[PDB]
Design a protein around this ligand. Structure first.
Ligand SMILES: COC(=O)[C@H](C#N)Cc1c(-c2ccc(C)cc2)c2c(N)ncnc2n1/C=C/CO
Ligand code: NA
Length: 299
């Protein structure tokens, strides 16, 4: 219980919201760069996020916590600094991206998500922007899931950590259905990620101009294109896999466990390594993407 200001030189902002901003920083002793989230304690209480991180950030593809401090008015959460930028944006700006590679990416991310769910953690805010590359190798290994700001571990009424496996202590009904629901959404978000990966556009929004009601009507219809233009080129394997991840019925949505058993994921070796024929508009997608979650998240 001593100091952060002491250990680190603070540099520029890298992200900013009402509850917290992230700044890049330097470990003075060693000269190594790191990110630090600064949470306002009177605005938000970050303890669940942090435990989730302490417990699980040892995962190769979960962001790794390196320090923490309680100034008094503020928390300081120090992690590895992600140097390879956001996942999807780098993927989109890649003219020669392939199915084979998208499969490696989704595999890595889903494996990570299958593990969180098995531990009773649902992420709840699984947008593409919360998924960064640690460096620029463009290797799946360098993928990190990074914002657990909205993540929730299944807890017992008494306040005791629980897993799906251990149902043998009783707990609330509408809550297991809630956690089952919330995991279904996580998979759904990976569905839109996959969708966007293969064709260069999002399934439910064309740009940041799409109104929320317009985007919610689309999501609600259950239907989306898996044909024409950019879809022509994609194997039916993958399209099948997408149809099931975005399945409008949350009870029918593939689990992460079942995503990993799909042949698109399993027979990655049979996947085409030649290029996907994708639309080329990264920034338009960023807009659409933001529009889709803004509409979803206005509560
Ligand atoms: C309120 O802001 C956020 O929550 C950010 C996100 N996502 C934090 C963030 C981090 C980061 C993530 C978690 C923790 C505990 C600390 C910092 C981070 C990092 N370790 N490297 C590069 N960019 C990072 N960003 C910025 C991404 C947006 O441009
Ligand atoms: Na980690």
């Amino acid at each position: 219980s001593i100091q952060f200001t002491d250990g680190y030189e603070v540099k520029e902002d890298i992200g900013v919201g009402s509850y917290s901003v992230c700044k890049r920083c330097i470990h003075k002793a060693t000269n190594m760069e790191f990110a630090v989230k600064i949470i306002d304690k009177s605005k938000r209480d970050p303890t669940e996020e942090i435990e989730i991180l302490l417990r699980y950030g040892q995962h190769p593809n979960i962001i790794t916590l390196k320090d923490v401090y309680d100034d008094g008015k503020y928390v300081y959460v120090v992690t590895e600094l992600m140097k390879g930028g956001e996942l999807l944006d780098k993927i989109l700006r890649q003219k020669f991206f392939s199915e084979r590679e998208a499969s490696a990416v989704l595999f890595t991310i889903t494996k990570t998500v299958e593990y969180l769910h098995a531990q009773g953690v649902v992420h709840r805010d699984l947008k593409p922007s919360n998924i960064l590359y640690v460096d620029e190798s463009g290797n799946p290994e360098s993928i990190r899931i990074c914002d657990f700001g909205f993540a929730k571990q299944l807890r017992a009424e008494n306040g005791l950590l629980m897993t799906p496996c251990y149902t043998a202590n009783f707990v609330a009904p509408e809550v297991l259905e809630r956690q089952g629901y919330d995991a279904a959404c996580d998979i759904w978000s990976l569905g839109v990620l996959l969708y966007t990966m293969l064709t260069g556009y999002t399934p439910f929004a064309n740009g940041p101009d799409d109104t929320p009601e317009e985007i919610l009507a689309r999501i609600g219809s259950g239907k989306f294109s898996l044909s024409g233009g950019y879809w022509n080129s994609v194997s039916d394997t993958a399209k099948d896999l997408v149809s099931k991840m975005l399945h409008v019925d949350p009870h029918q949505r593939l689990t992460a466990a079942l995503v990993l058993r799909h042949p698109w994921i399993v027979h990655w070796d049979q996947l085409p390594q030649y290029q996907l024929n994708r639309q080329d508009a990264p920034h338009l997608v960023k807009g659409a993407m933001a529009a889709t979650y803004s509409a979803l998240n206005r509560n």
